[PDB]
Write a protein that binds this ligand. Structure first.
Ligand SMILES: CCC1=C(C)/C(=C/C2=NC(=C\c3[nH]c(/C=C4\NC(=O)[C@H](C)[C@H]4CC)c(C)c3CCC(=O)O)/C(CCC(=O)O)=C2C)NC1=O
Ligand SMILES: CCC1=C(C)/C(=C/C2=NC(=C\c3[nH]c(/C=C4\NC(=O)[C@H](C)[C@H]4CC)c(C)c3CCC(=O)O)/C(CCC(=O)O)=C2C)NC1=O
Ligand SMILES: CCC1=C(C)/C(=C/C2=NC(=C\c3[nH]c(/C=C4\NC(=O)[C@H](C)[C@H]4CC)c(C)c3CCC(=O)O)/C(CCC(=O)O)=C2C)NC1=O
Ligand SMILES: CCC1=C(C)/C(=C/C2=NC(=C\c3[nH]c(/C=C4\NC(=O)[C@H](C)[C@H]4CC)c(C)c3CCC(=O)O)/C(CCC(=O)O)=C2C)NC1=O
Ligand SMILES: CCC1=C(C)/C(=C/C2=NC(=C\c3[nH]c(/C=C4\NC(=O)[C@H](C)[C@H]4CC)c(C)c3CCC(=O)O)/C(CCC(=O)O)=C2C)NC1=O
Ligand SMILES: CCC1=C(C)/C(=C/C2=NC(=C\c3[nH]c(/C=C4\NC(=O)[C@H](C)[C@H]4CC)c(C)c3CCC(=O)O)/C(CCC(=O)O)=C2C)NC1=O
Ligand SMILES: CCC1=C(C)/C(=C/C2=NC(=C\c3[nH]c(/C=C4\NC(=O)[C@H](C)[C@H]4CC)c(C)c3CCC(=O)O)/C(CCC(=O)O)=C2C)NC1=O
Ligand SMILES: CCC1=C(C)/C(=C/C2=NC(=C\c3[nH]c(/C=C4\NC(=O)[C@H](C)[C@H]4CC)c(C)c3CCC(=O)O)/C(CCC(=O)O)=C2C)NC1=O
Lengths: 173, 98, 48, 160, 48, 49, 161, 161, 160, 161, 160, 161, 161
C-alpha cells in the first residue's frame, strides 16, 4: 500500500526532482484533514459492531431474496446460518479496510488487498455482486448520519465506499 | 505438513485462482511461473494481448494458422478487457502512417 | 490478517493430520511416513 | 511513511487500529508543518550542502581524487557529487514521510552490490554522507538538527 | 481498476457430511482402496 | 417464526435420511445468539421440545 | 472434424493395418445406432428455439443474474447469453450425429475457458444451465437417444470446468 | 465430492422442499443395491493386481509402446503406466460406492487431458487399457455389478478423450 | 482389530467417534460368536491343511523339492511346512480381529527382503498359500469360505 | 471510456436505484466545474502546436537523442516523437473534459510500455518530455485548470513507468 | 453522455473537439438545474406513470392478458411492470446525461433477440412505452414535455 | 539436462540400437575438446566480476536506464539486474562444458520472456548486455574457446527475442 | 531486409560519419566477391530440385519417419516437408546474394521454433536435412561459393536448434 504522502513522494522521485510548492500543497491538504480523519476512525471503532447490524438489516429488508433458497443454480447467498455467518464476515472486511484508507487519504490499500482478485472469488462461489455493492453503499449512508453538521467530513467518508462500488461495478455504459 | 486448502482456513481473495490451481496434480506441468507474473501484473497497466485470452492471437508468420497456446503448452493468461478498448498496433512501415 | 466463523470450517470432510509420536504401531508409523511422501513429492514415489 | 507502517501492523493482526497507534498517528500530523519546514530548508540549500559536503570528503579521503582513484578526473568528480545529491534528496523524502522507508526502497537495498560492481569504495560514500550531515545540521536550530540527524544516521549504518 | 486476473475455478464449498461420504473420503485421502473394516460400516448403513 | 420451525423439521429429516447430525450442528450452533435480540430464546427451546 | 468412422480408419491408418475383426465391432456399433441418432437430431432442430427457452427458465431465469449487478442483466448481456446456448445445443447435436466429440473440442472447447475468465462470466452458473438443457432435451429425444445427447453435454462441462 | 444421497438432498434442499415421492425414488435404488455394490468393491480389492496385469497383457503388452521409441518403454515409464491403471481402478470403485461420478471430476478428470498432452502420453492407447479393464472386471464382480462399474469406467474414457 | 483402526482415524480428525463409526463397533462385537467358531474350526485342522496344502504345492512346483531347489532334503521341507503353519496361524488372527493388519505387521511387511535373503522364490511361497486356501475353504460352508477366503487372498497379493 | 456523468449513472444503475440526492450532489459538482473545463480545452486546441514546440525545445532538443545514434535522430523518427506528444496532449484533454482518467487506461496506456520496449524508445526521456509539457500547458490554462490537467499528465507518467 | 459522445467522434477522426462541439457542451452544463428537476418529477411518480400507463396498455392490447397471452396471470403481469419500470428508469438517465447513450447501452442493444427468446411480442412492448409517454408528458410543461418526449421517441423508434 | 555424451546415447536408445560409427564420431568430437572446455570454464569463473563489470560499462552504464524514470534506476534495480547477468554467464558456462544447450532451456529460458514482460524489463537492452558480455569473454579465453562460449550466448538471446 | 551495402551505410550513419577507409574496405570486399555470388545463385536455381532430392534420400528417406506413424508419413505430410526444404535452400541463396543474413531473421526464423514445437515436427531430423543440403550444394558451387553458402545454412540451423 501507499499513503497520500508516499504517493506524492513517489510521483516526484519518478522525475528525479525535489518537492516544490505544488507537491507541498498536496501534503498540507492531508496534514489539515489528518486530525479530522482520526475522529472518523475512532467513531467507527466505537460503533463498529452496531453499524454492521443496520447495514445487514436494511440490506435484507430490500433484498428478501438473499435469505431464501438458492435455486438450482447454486448461488451463494445468506441462505443458511453457515452462509449468513460467512456473509456477515464480509461486511466487516469492507468496514475495516475502509477505515484504514480514511486515515491513509488514498485508495491504494483498497485495491491491493480487497479488489485485486475479488470478482474472481465471488464469481467462483457465485456470490452476487449487486447486493454487495448495495451494502457497501448502505454503510456510507449510515456512517454519514453521525457527521451532518459539517460537510467536509462527508467527502472524506464517501471516498472509500465510493471506490469499492465503482471498481466492483460492471461497465454497462 | 498438510495442504491448507479452501475449507480449512480463512482465505484471501488475492491469490485465489493461483492457489486453487497449485493444489492439483497438474501443477508440476506449468513450467512458467504463475505468481511472479500475476503479483506484478496487478501493479502494471493492461497487457499487450488479445481482448480474450493470450492464446487467441496467432503467430504473424508467412503461412500460418499456428496458435501455440493450447492444452499442450499450458500458458493461458486471461486479463479483464473492457468493451471499448483499442490495441496499440505497430505500423509495418514509417511510424507516422498509423 | 483474516478471520473466519469457526463453523464454516467444521462443515465437510474434515481433512486429517498425521503425527509421528514414537511408540505407535508400525502401521501408524508407516501411514505417517507414506503421508510425508505424498506431501513432499506430490505422490507416493516409494511404492510407485 | 509512519502512517502506512501503522496500518499494515494492525492489518496483520486482523484487528482495527489500537490506541497506541491512533496516538502515534496524532503525533505525526501535529508534527506535520514542522517537518515540511525542515525538509524544505535542505531542499533550498542543496548546492551549499553538496559542495561543502564533497569538499570535506576530498580532504578525509584524498586517494579517491589521486591518479588511479575512482573519482580521479573532472568527469568522475562530477559524478561523485552527483551521488551526494541523490542521497540528500532521499533524506528529505524520509523526513517528510516520518520514517526511513523511502531511503531504504530507493538507494539502500542492494547498495553494496551496486558500488562493488562499479569499483567505488563504499566506505567513501559513507564518509561523504557524514560530511553532508555536518553542513546540513548547521542550517537548523538546536532541536531540529537532532531530528534530522536520525535520518542521516540511518543511511550511514545501512552503508556499512 | 483491476488490471490482472488469476482465473476463477469452479469450486463448491463443503455443505455437510453423510455416513456414506465420510467412510469413502477417508480411504481416498490415504490411497488405501477402502479397507475391509470400512467396507462393513458402509453396508450396515445401507441396510437400514 | 413459522419459517424457522419448518427448517428445524425439514433439515431434521435430511439428517436421518443422510448419515449424521453434522448438517444440524453446522446450522444451529451459533444460531440462538444471532437472533435472540429479536426473539425470546425461551420460546424456542419449548417449541423444539 | 472426424466422426466415429474416420476415427476408426485413422487408428488403423497410423499402424499400417487393415481393419481387423475388432475395428469392425466399433464400426458395427455405430451402424446399429445410426438411424436412432438421425431420428434424434431431426427433432432437436424443430424444438431448438424452445429447448433453450425452457432451459433458461428453470435454471437461471428469475435468479439474481437477471437482477441489476449480475451477469446477463442488460439486454446486450442477455442476448449474448442465449447466443452461447445455441452454440452448445447446435454443436452437441453435430457431435452426436458423428458420434465423436472432435467437432466440439475443435471449434467450441478450444479456448473457451480462457475467454470466459477474461470476460468475467460465471463458469459455475453456465455449467448448471447446460445441465438444465440436458434434461429438457431428454424429454423430447427420449431416454434412449437422450443419454447419448447428454454424453456430449457433459463434455462441454468437463472441458469448460 | 458428493454421494447420491448428497445429490438428491441438495436438489430438494435448494428448492426449499421436503423429499417427495419422486425424490425418494432415486434414493431407494441406491439403498437397496448397497449389499450388491459392497460385494463388488471387496472382490475388486482382492484382485486389484490381477486385473491390471490381464488388462495390460490384453491391450498394450506386445505392441509398439512396449518396444523402444514408444511411450512406456523404459522401466520408469512402465511403472508409472500401471500406477495410473491403479488410479482409475481405485476411483472407479469410489464412485461405484458413492453412487455419484462427482468424485471423478474433482480429482481425476480435472487436469487429466492437460497432463497427458504435456507429457506426451497417448490418450487413445489409454482408453483401450481402460476399456479392457472394464471387460476384465465384468467377469469377476459378475454381470449385475459389472454393469454398474462400467458406468464409471465409461465416464472416464468420455472425459479422457 | 477394527476397534483400534476405527479410533486412529477419529483421533487424526481430532473429534469423537462419529455415530456411524460407533455402529461399526457394535456390529463387529455382535459377530464375535461367529468369528470364534470359524477360526476355531480351522485350528482343529492344522495337519490336514498344512500337510495336504503342502503336498499339492510339491506337485505344482516339483523343482523346489528337487536337487538344487530350496526345499531339497528332510530339513528344508520340514522348514517349509513350518511357515505354512505360520501363515495359517496368522489367518486365524485376522478372522478374530476383523482386519488383515495382524497378518500385515506379522509376515507381510519386509517379507520380500527376508525371503530374498534366504534364496526363497516368493512365487513358490504364495503357491502354498493358494493351496492351503482350497483345503481350508473346503471344510467351511459357502458363507464362511467367502469370508475366510479374503484373508487368504489378501496375503497372496502382498506376496507378489 | 466513461466520464463523470456516466460514473454516477453506472453506480446507481448497478444497485437498481432510480437516483438519490447524494449522487445528484456529485452531478451538480461537475456542472459547477464544466465551464472551466470547456475554456481550458479550447485554449489547448488552439495552442496544441506551440505547447509541443516549447516542450521539445526545453527538454530534448539539442541532446544526444537528436544527434546521430540516438532515438529521434532521423526525420522519420523526429516526426514520430512529435506525433506521440500530440497523443498525450490530446488524450489528456479528453480526460480533462470527462473528469475521469478511464480513457487513458483503454486507449493510451493499454500495453504501451511493452510497445516502447520492443521499438527501443527511451522511457525515461518520454517521462521528462511529458513533465516538461506539463508546466508549459499549465501556464496557458492557468493554475486551476492546469492543476486538473496535470492530474492526467501524472497519470500517464505513473502508467508508463 | 453528451461529453462521452463528443469525445468519441473527435477520437474517431484524431482531432480536438471543435468549437461547435464545445459550445453544445457549454449549454449542456448550464442547464443542469432544469433537467435535474425534470428528472426528479419523473422519479417521484414512478407508480402513477407505471401503473396508469400499464393499465391503458392492457385494454389497448387484451391479447397479452387473455388466456394464451404472454403476460397471462398475476405473476407474469407483474414482470410486465418490471420492464415498464426499467425503461422509465433509463429514460431519466438520458435526461440527466443529455444523450440516448444510457438508454441504448442498457436495454436497446439486442432487445429484439431478448424478447424473441422470451416469447413476448416486441410490437406490444413499444405500445406500453408510448402509453407511459402520455402520462409523463401530462406532468411536465410544454417546454419541458418536449425534452422528456425526445427520449421516449428514440426508444419507440429503436424498438421496431 | 543432458550433455553431448548423453545426447548421443538417447538418440541411439530411442531406436534400440547400439552405438554405430556415425554416433562414435560425435563421441570423439567431444573427447578431443574436453580439455579445452575445462580450461575456459576455470578462467571464466575467476574473471566473472570483471566480465560483467565491463559489459555493463560498455552497454548500459551512462544510458537512459540508469537515470530516474528508466529501468534499473534505484540501487535494488541496479543490483537485481547485474544478478541477471551473473545467471547468463554461469549458465552459458554450464552449456559450454556439457556441449549441449539443453540446460539453457529448462533452468534459464523456459518462461523467461513472460517474466520480463510482466516485470517491464526491456528485452532489447538485455540482449545488448549479453552481446557486450560475449565480446569481453571472447578476448579472455581465446579465439577457439571464445567462439564456443559465443555459441551459447546466442542461444540465450535467440531464446529471449 | 538490408544487404551488405546497407549494413555499411547504416553503421556509418549511426556514428554520423562519412564513409572512411575502414568502411570503404568492407565495400570493396563485397564488390570484389560480388560476381562469384551471382554465379553460385544461378547454379543453385538450376539444381534446386536436385539438391533437395539428394538431401532427402541421404537423410530421412528410409527411416521410420516415412513409415506409418511417423511425422511426414502421408503424401500431404511428405509434400509439406520438401516444401520446407525448398524455402531453406531458396532463402539461403537470398542471404548469400545480399551478403547479410538479415533476410533470414525477418522472414524465416521469426517464431519458427514455436511453429515446429506446435505441430510436432522433429527439430533434430530437420537440422540433418539442412546439413545434407549443405554438402550437396557445396559440391556444385565449388569451394569459395560453397563456403559462403554454408555460412547461411548454419545460420538457419543455429536459430532452429
Ligand atoms: C479483505 C477483502 C476480502 C473479501 C471481501 C473476502 C471475501 C470472501 N467471501 C467468502 C465467502 C462468502 N461470502 C458470502 C457473502 C454474501 N452473500 C450474500 O448473499 C451477500 C451478497 C454477501 C454478504 C454481503 C457468502 C454466502 C459466502 C459463502 C459462500 C458459500 O460457501 O456458499 C470467501 C470464502 C470463504 C473464506 O473466506 O474462506 C472469501 C475469501 N476475502 C477477502 O480477503
Ligand atoms: C435449519 C437450520 C437453520 C435455521 C433454523 C436458521 C434460521 C435463521 N433465522 C433467522 C432470523 C430470525 N428468526 C426468527 C425467529 C425464530 N426462529 C426460531 O427458530 C423460532 C421459531 C423463532 C423465535 C421464537 C426471527 C424473528 C428472525 C429475524 C431476526 C432479525 O430481524 O434479524 C436468520 C437470519 C435471516 C432471516 O431469516 O431473517 C437465519 C439464517 N438458519 C439455519 O440454517
Ligand atoms: C493512442 C496512444 C498511443 C501511443 C502513445 C502510441 C505510440 C507508438 N509510438 C510509436 C513509435 C515511435 N515513438 C517514438 C517516440 C520517441 N522517441 C524519442 O526519442 C522520444 C523520447 C519519444 C517521444 C517523446 C519514435 C522515435 C518512434 C519510431 C520508432 C521506429 O520507427 O523505430 C509506434 C509505432 C508506429 C505506429 O504509429 O504505428 C506506436 C504505435 N500509439 C498509440 O496508439
Ligand atoms: C538513488 C540511489 C542511486 C545511487 C546512489 C546511484 C549511483 C550510481 N553511481 C554511478 C557512478 C559513479 N559513482 C561514483 C562515486 C564516488 N566516487 C568516489 O570516489 C566517492 C567515494 C563516490 C561518491 C561519494 C563515481 C566515480 C562513478 C563513475 C564510475 C565510472 O564511471 O566508472 C552510476 C553509473 C552512472 C550513473 O551515474 O548513472 C550510478 C547508476 N544510482 C542510484 O539510483
Ligand atoms: C434494462 C432493460 C431490460 C429489460 C426490458 C429486461 C426484460 C426481462 N423480461 C423478462 C421476462 C418477461 N417479460 C415479460 C414481458 C411482457 N409480457 C407482456 O405481455 C408484455 C407485452 C411484456 C411487457 C410490456 C413476460 C411475460 C416475462 C416472463 C416470461 C415467461 O415467464 O415465460 C426477463 C426474465 C426474468 C428476469 O430476469 O427479470 C428479463 C431479464 N431485462 C432488462 O435488463
Ligand atoms: C488420481 C488421478 C491422477 C492421474 C491419472 C495422474 C497421472 C500422472 N501420470 C504421470 C506420468 C506418466 N503416465 C504415463 C502413462 C501411460 N503410459 C502409457 O503408455 C499408457 C498409455 C499410460 C498409462 C495407461 C507415463 C509413461 C508417465 C511418465 C511420463 C514420463 O516420465 O515422461 C504423472 C507424473 C508424476 C508421477 O508419475 O509421479 C502424473 C501426475 N495423477 C493423478 O493424480
Ligand atoms: C539527416 C536528416 C536530418 C535533418 C535534416 C535534421 C535536422 C534538425 N535541424 C534542427 C535544427 C535547426 N535547423 C535550422 C535550419 C535552418 N535555418 C535556416 O534559416 C535555414 C533555412 C535552415 C538550414 C538551411 C535551425 C536554425 C535550427 C535550430 C532552431 C531551433 O533551435 O529551434 C534540429 C534540432 C537540433 C539539432 O540540430 O539536433 C534537428 C534534429 N535531423 C536529421 O536527422
Ligand atoms: C517460411 C517459414 C515457414 C516454415 C518453415 C513453416 C512451417 C510450417 N511447416 C508446416 C508443416 C509441416 N512441416 C513439415 C516438415 C518436416 N516434418 C518432418 O518430419 C521433417 C523433420 C521436417 C522437414 C525437414 C511437415 C511434415 C509438416 C506437416 C505437419 C502436419 O501436417 O501436421 C506448417 C503447417 C502448415 C502446412 O503444413 O501447410 C508450417 C506453418 N511455415 C512458414 O511460413
Amino acid at each position: 500500500m501507499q499513503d497520500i504522502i508516499t504517493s506524492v513522494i513517489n510521483q516526484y522521485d519518478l522525475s528525479g526532482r525535489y518537492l516544490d510548492i505544488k507537491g507541498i500543497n498536496q501534503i498540507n491538504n492531508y496534514f489539515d484533514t489528518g486530525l479530522k480523519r482520526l475522529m472518523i476512525a475512532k467513531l467507527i471503532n466505537k460503533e463498529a459492531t452496531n453499524l454492521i447490524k443496520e447495514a445487514s438489516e436494511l440490506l435484507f429488508i430490500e433484498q428478501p431474496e438473499l435469505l431464501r433458497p438458492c435455486g438450482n443454480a447454486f448461488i451463494g447467498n445468506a441462505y443458511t446460518t453457515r452462509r449468513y455467518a460467512a456473509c456477515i464476515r464480509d461486511i466487516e472486511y469492507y468496514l475495516r479496510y475502509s477505515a484504514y484508507s480514511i486515515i491513509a487519504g488514498n485508495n491504494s490499500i483498497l485495491d491491493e488487498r480487497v479488489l485485486d482478485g475479488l470478482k474472481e472469488t465471488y464469481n467462483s462461489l457465485l456470490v452476487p455482486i449487486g447486493p454487495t455493492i448495495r451494502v457497501i453503499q448502505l454503510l456510507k449512508e449510515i456512517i454519514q448520519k453521525k457527521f451532518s453538521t459539517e460537510n467536509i467530513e462527508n467527502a472524506i467518508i464517501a471516498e472509500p465506499f465510493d471506490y469499492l462500488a465503482i471498481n466492483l461495478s460492471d461497465k454497462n455504459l | 505438513p498438510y495442504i491448507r486448502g479452501f475449507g480449512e482456513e480463512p482465505q484471501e481473495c488475492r491469490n485465489w485462482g493461483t492457489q486453487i490451481d497449485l493444489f492439483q496434480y497438474s501443477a508440476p506441468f506449468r513450467k512458467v511461473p504463475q505468481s511472479i507474473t500475476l503479483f506484478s501484473d496487478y501493479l502494471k497497466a493492461l497487457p499487450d494481448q488479445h481482448p480474450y485470452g493470450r492464446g487467441n492471437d496467432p503467430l504473424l508468420i508467412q503461412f500460418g494458422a499456428i496458435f501455440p497456446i493450447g492444452t499442450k503448452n499450458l500458458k493461458q493468461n486471461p486479463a479483464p478487457f473492457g468493451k471499448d478498448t483499442r490495441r496499440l498496433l505497430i505500423r509495418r512501415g514509417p511510424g507516422i502512417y498509423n | 490478517g483474516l478471520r473466519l466463523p469457526q463453523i464454516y470450517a467444521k462443515a465437510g470432510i474434515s481433512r486429517q493430520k498425521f503425527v509421528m509420536k514414537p511408540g505407535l504401531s508400525t502401521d501408524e508409523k508407516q501411514s505417517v511416513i507414506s503421508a510425508c511422501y505424498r506431501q513432499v513429492f506430490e505422490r507416493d514415489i516409494s511404492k510407485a | 511513511s509512519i502512517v502506512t507502517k501503522s496500518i499494515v501492523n494492525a492489518d496483520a493482526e486482523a484487528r482495527y487500529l489500537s490506541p497506541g497507534e491512533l496516538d502515534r498517528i496524532k503525533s505525526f500530523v501535529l508534527s506535520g508543518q514542522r517537518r515540511l519546514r525542515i525538509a524544505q530548508t535542505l531542499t533550498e540549500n542543496r548546492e551549499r550542502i553538496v559542495k561543502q559536503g564533497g569538499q570535506q570528503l576530498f580532504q578525509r579521503r584524498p586517494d579517491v581524487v589521486s591518479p588511479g582513484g575512482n573519482a580521479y578526473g573532472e568527469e568522475m568528480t562530477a559524478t561523485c557529487l552527483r551521488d551526494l545529491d541523490y542521497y540528500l534528496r532521499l533524506v528529505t523524502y524520509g523526513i517528510i514521510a516520518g520514517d526511513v522507508t523511502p531511503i531504504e526502497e530507493i538507494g539502500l537495498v542492494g547498495v553494496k552490490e551496486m558500488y562493488s560492481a562499479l569499483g567505488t569504495p563504499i566506505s567513501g560514500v559513507a564518509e561523504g554522507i557524514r560530511c553532508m550531515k555536518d553542513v546540513a545540521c548547521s542550517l537548523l536550530s538546536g532541536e531540529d538538527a537532532a531530528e534530522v540527524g536520525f535520518y542521516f544516521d540511518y543511511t550511514l549504518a545501512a552503508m556499512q | 481498476v483491476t488490471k490482472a486476473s488469476g482465473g476463477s475455478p469452479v469450486v463448491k464449498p463443503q455443505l455437510y457430511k453423510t455416513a456414506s461420504m465420510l467412510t469413502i473420503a477417508q480411504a481416498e485421502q490415504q490411497d488405501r482402496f477402502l479397507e475391509l473394516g470400512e467396507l462393513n460400516q458402509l453396508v450396515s448403513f445401507l441396510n437400514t | 417464526s413459522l419459517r424457522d420451525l419448518d427448517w428445524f423439521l425439514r433439515y431434521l429429516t435430511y439428517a436421518i435420511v443422510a448419515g449424521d447430525p453434522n448438517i444440524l450442528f453446522v446450522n444451529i450452533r451459533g444460531l440462538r445468539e444471532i437472533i435472540e435480540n429479536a426473539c425470546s430464546s425461551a420460546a424456542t427451546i419449548v417449541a423444539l421440545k | 472434424m472426424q466422426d466415429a468412422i474416420t476415427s476408426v480408419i485413422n487408428a488403423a491408418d497410423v499402424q499400417g493395418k487393415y481393419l481387423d475383426a475388432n475395428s469392425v465391432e466399433k464400426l458395427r456399433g455405430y451402424f446399429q445406432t445410426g438411424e436412432l441418432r438421425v431420428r434424434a437430431a431431426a427433432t432437436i432442430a424443430a424444438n431448438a428455439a424452445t429447448i433453450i427457452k425452457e432451459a433458461v427458465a428453470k435454471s437461471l431465469l428469475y435468479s439474481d443474474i437477471t437482477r441489476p449487478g449480475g451477469n446477463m442483466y442488460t439486454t446486450r448481456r442477455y442476448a449474448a447469453c442465449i447466443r452461447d446456448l445455441d452454440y452448445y445445443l447446435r454443436y452437441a447435436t453435430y457431435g452426436m450425429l458423428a458420434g465423436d466429440p472432435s467437432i466440439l473440442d475443435e471449434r467450441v472447447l478450444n479456448g473457451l475457458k480462457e475467454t470466459y475468465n477474461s470476460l468475467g462470466v460465471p463458469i459455475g452458473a453456465t455449467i448448471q444451465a447446460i445441465q438444465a438443457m440436458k434434461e429438457v432435451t431428454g424429454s423430447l429425444v427420449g431416454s434412449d437417444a437422450g443419454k447419448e445427447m447428454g454424453l456430449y453435454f457433459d463434455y462441454i462441462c468437463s472441458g469448460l470446468s
